[PDB]
């Protein structure tokens with residue numbers, strides 16, 4: 395019967411925002427107790443999934459590095475299933491997996507625009523959640539293939555609904571975020587409102603919750619297609635709309651998804667994942 399204080403120490407990081415008004419922890423390096431959590435979740439025999447898509451040139455450029463790194467840093471000490479959606483299985487890189495890692499590969503149709511490739515994920519993930527994932531995992535993360543694990547990315551990140559603070563905006567003012575601002579779009583957020591700017595290529599929660607994230611995001615993607623319109627940052631735009639209405643029970647610091655082009659500020663203590671360079 396886990397308490398927040400059993401594992402979370404917000405005062406270890408006083409220079410940053412460690413909790414939200416709706417009372418969700420923003421998880422920053424130095425704030426979490428991975429050993430206590432590891433013991434608690436292992437006792438419950440939890441299983442964590444991870445979807446990743448790679449279509450076209452993204453297979454040779456990104457997938458090996460994503461999977462190789464995931465194997466060594468993702469939920470170590472816990473059964474993890476990699477869900478790999480590719481258009482061409484014959485180019486799939488062949489990697490040795492360590493203990494408590496397994497996977498299964500699916501063939502997908504390769505969408506024509508790369509914008510649709512990225513946006514179809516929302517449909518595809520939800521179909522998989524219904525078909526199998528709901529039966530297989532207790533928690534699930536969905537991620538861009540053009541990222542790499544740099545260090546441990548563990549059970550401290552688990553919750554009902556998990557969002558990623560986007561690296562370029564965590565410090566910024568809500569009136570400056572790159573939200574979709576055209577009212578003609580489903581992703582629309584008015585000025586004056588919004589809590590954080592979240593990342594498109596990293597989110598998670600229970601299968602139940604991720605089905606809701608994806609279903610609502612794609613409903614708004616479909617609706618935008620029917621008004622001759624396309625959100626600024628596509629699926630990330632709809633994800634931000636969605637998280638404004640349905641607040642995430644957990645937010646991850648930019649340490650969990652850093653862009654090195656920004657440099658390295660004093661805030662970013664130990665990078666767990668960054669963008670492939």
Ligand SMILES: O=c1ccn([C@@H]2O[C@H](COP(=O)(O)OP(=O)(O)O)[C@@H](O)[C@H]2O)c(=O)[nH]1
Pocket residue numbers: 446447448449450451452508511512537538539540595
């Ligand atoms: O040709 C493509 C285009 C996109 N993607 C997938 O769609 C995601 C989102 O695209 P991208 O990373 O290019 O978004 P960006 O990070 O540039 O905003 C990628 O991470 C891939 O998983 C892909 O596999 N092949």
Ligand SMILES: [Mn+2]
Pocket residue numbers: 538539540595
């Ligand atoms: Mn990406």
